[PDB]
Amino acid sequence: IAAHKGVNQAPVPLKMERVGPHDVHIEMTAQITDIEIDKGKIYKAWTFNGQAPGPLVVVNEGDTIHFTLKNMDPVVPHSMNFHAVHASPSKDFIDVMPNKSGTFTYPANKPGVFMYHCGTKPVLQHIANGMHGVIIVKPKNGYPTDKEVDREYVLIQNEWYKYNDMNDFQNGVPSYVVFSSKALKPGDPNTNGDTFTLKEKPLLAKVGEKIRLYINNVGPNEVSSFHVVGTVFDDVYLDGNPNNHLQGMQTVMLPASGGAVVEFTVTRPGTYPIVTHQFNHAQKGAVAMLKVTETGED
Amino acid sequence: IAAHKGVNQAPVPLKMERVGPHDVHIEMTAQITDIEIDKGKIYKAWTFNGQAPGPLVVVNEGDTIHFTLKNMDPVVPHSMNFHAVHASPSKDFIDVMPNKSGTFTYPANKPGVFMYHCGTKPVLQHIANGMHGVIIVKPKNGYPTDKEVDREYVLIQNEWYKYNDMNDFQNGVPSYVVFSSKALKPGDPNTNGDTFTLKEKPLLAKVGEKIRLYINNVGPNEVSSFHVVGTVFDDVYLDGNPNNHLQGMQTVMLPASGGAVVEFTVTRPGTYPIVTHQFNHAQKGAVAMLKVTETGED
Amino acid sequence: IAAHKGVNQAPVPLKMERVGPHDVHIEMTAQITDIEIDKGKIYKAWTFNGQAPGPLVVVNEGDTIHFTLKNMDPVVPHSMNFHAVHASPSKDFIDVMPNKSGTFTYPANKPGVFMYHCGTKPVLQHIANGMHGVIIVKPKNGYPTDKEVDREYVLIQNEWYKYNDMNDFQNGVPSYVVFSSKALKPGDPNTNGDTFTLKEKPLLAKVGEKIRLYINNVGPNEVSSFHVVGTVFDDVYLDGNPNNHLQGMQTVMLPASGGAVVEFTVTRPGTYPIVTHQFNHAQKGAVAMLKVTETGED
Ligand SMILES: [Cl-]
Ligand SMILES: [Cl-]
Ligand SMILES: [Cl-]
Ligand SMILES: [Cu+2]
Ligand SMILES: [Cu+2]
Ligand SMILES: [Cu+2]
Ligand SMILES: [Cu+2]
Ligand SMILES: [Cu+2]
Ligand SMILES: [Cu+2]
Ligand SMILES: [Cu+2]
Ligand SMILES: [Cu+2]
Ligand SMILES: [Cu+2]
Ligand SMILES: [Cu+2]
Ligand SMILES: [Cu+2]
Ligand SMILES: [Cu+2]
Ligand SMILES: [Cu+2]
Ligand SMILES: [Cu+2]
Ligand SMILES: [Cu+2]
Ligand code: NA
Ligand code: NA
Ligand code: NA
Ligand code: NA
Ligand code: NA
Ligand code: NA
């Protein structure tokens, strides 16, 4: 795209603020930002806020979201589809033109771990170029295991293909499959989908802890066989809905866009890989690490 | 196949009639019929009754099916495998030769949304060329959410490959992935697996309704990440068995041959896409539309 | 690998013995063994004990496993990862060098049907070359349907690729997809992952029986759509955990490394195919047979 040559828009922080007991404002950008997806490999990603996947959004069950998208792309329209919400797609998930903003309002009625993404046609192109992310909707009544959880993180799986290549997007294997982590609390890591950061800077935990991961496989195209080496999931809530409660799973099958809340215990000090067990994808980048120490500090 | 050149057998209606409180007769054909699977692209499909996927069958839990296949193919044997039934495959799912009929009897003991397909070796070839469909077995005691449902439709996902090409069937990506709808009540659409009909003639609903979809991914080869844009599934019954009850799912993972009953609420007027969220497949055709109006009429 | 040329190490029996009410010893080898994966096609597999998948391990919930690996490979290190156990991967799943042994101890706290595999980097290479298997952990309180089961077997699904070809392992379709059975009781078959043995020598059962299969899809790369022709699964326990209880499923979606306990009734004499319903994989070998006779003998 001629108008994207040389464009590298600096990341912009997510803007969120609560405006009522059940109403929140969210503003994001659509912007074109260079991301190092593998060592020496830059992808000029189509992004929300200069991150791919985009910034984490967390709201409460029953919140109405007043969402603004500011399109900084000089030529391509962009939009927003939140899987969390009940909305009219043809009125509320519509395109925002270059250098314009649009505001859309809709409720998040359902607890869970939802994908969000750009919904501009061709949707495959917008997702594959980087316009994906997660919104967590916290259940009003919690999860039955909340009291047992010591530490929690968010992980997202995505693929990367040949740059802006619709033939490859439709017909080719992924070049990379990757994990990223998005921060829930101050001090948590906040990373983009790449083959290396969560290997070189593992997530941290303490011996004996029960860890919760909020996970989503945003695709665009693959399913995920999510597994933590050296443990078994004590409890799994499919899509993060507390009703969808499995126990003692080795591996959680996630569709494309599928989410889960998974919980597991780390019993011994060491480094614990986190994979998709589709090992072709793991080999192409989709391995993160959890470093478990006697203190929980590095 | 030399004997199929120029052959285009007109579709033949499904013949069904109840013959006892727990016994039904079903007659279908195997026939060779040209279907427009994408604009300008004719596939000389191997079919039941001149439809691909084939005609919808609906029976009640506990019905015994007395099934007749009339093979109109001039050269290829065909057969019938219903996933709904308990049967001896080597006695009851056997081949019917060209220009012959066979009758097979077996019970449908289990409620749900089942695949049916030709079972003639090589089964991949017969399924991929179009010999797939759905049989719904209605639960004797219903679903716990029956009273909440306002409107219901059937959707089926399938793939299409290069014509009768066993190398492609085994080793290649699908050329098209498609949805079709099969009629449950007079006035419902009844379509074949193509890339366009359910975009140009969306399914219809009314603002505020709870919609039930009976869905099955017949493959032959892919899994499906089934998602309705702008809503969340209130309730999901895996394989249509009332016991297998999930709530609040964004996306339902279907294996090849996998079924579900899914229910969701449409809260606002507009057009709602229905996808597999494996977006390579969506791009290759697997997007249907649901048009939601203030009246439920177009 | 030059040091593997001409190497064909004869299979070695699994060594297991109970050493306390909640402690068991297991010794396995890593060894290089020629396996006929399709007629006329030898794969010089990387194996545990000269089988691929490896030998079946069965323990009780709450057993601690004292595991020894004896590496007979002349040049490649190998290791062991049991999905059943809680362990430190970086201390307990570590490499054993050629011509050495290592012993590792860890508890199997969770009931189910778990994958095991070599964990040596690149893990994809070790799994794809044959270093995979199943460990069953029997639930202390059984399954609620135990009293109904008449006969049981273990089935494992795996893929085979071009020989030791990491490009193919990462980027190519499988050349073969296969089932094997591993013996639970004297007289049960014990086979390797090949395209033919369970067709030519079907598993045996008796008309009217309820059959339990302990199943796992070890991959390395594909998911599985597990289906028995001519029946419906009465009960399914995902990952073999008794809590994860589905009923009346036609087909069970298994992630890579995913397990299940599935139970079904065979109502009539005949031969019943067992497939992955991803029919490209079935065509490439993944069809086993269950022969149901009036006596249960051939
Ligand atoms: Cl692993
Ligand atoms: Cl979508
Ligand atoms: Cl089948
Ligand atoms: Cu309030
Ligand atoms: Cu506002
Ligand atoms: Cu966009
Ligand atoms: Cu979406
Ligand atoms: Cu704790
Ligand atoms: Cu009656
Ligand atoms: Cu009759
Ligand atoms: Cu046929
Ligand atoms: Cu089938
Ligand atoms: Cu209503
Ligand atoms: Cu004891
Ligand atoms: Cu010992
Ligand atoms: Cu190894
Ligand atoms: Cu593993
Ligand atoms: Cu019995
Ligand atoms: Na792929
Ligand atoms: Na792919
Ligand atoms: Na494919
Ligand atoms: Na495919
Ligand atoms: Na594949
Ligand atoms: Na593959």
Residue numbers in the entry:
A (entry chain A), B (entry chain A), C (entry chain A): 18 to 315
Q: What does the report in the manuscript say about this coordinate set?
A:
CuNIRs typically have an ∼110 kDa homotrimeric structure, like a Reuleaux triangle. Each protomer contains one type 1 copper (T1Cu) and one type 2 copper (T2Cu) site. The Cys residue forms a peptide-bond bridge (Cys-His bridge) together with one of the His ligands at the T2Cu site to transfer the electron to the catalytic T2Cu site, which is coordinated by three His residues and an axial water molecule.
The structures of D98N without NO2- and C135A/D98N with NO2- were determined at 1.05 and 1.12 Å resolution, respectively. A GK-like conformation of D98N is not observed in the D98N structure without NO2-, which indicates that repulsion between NO2- and Asn98 results in the GK-like conformation.
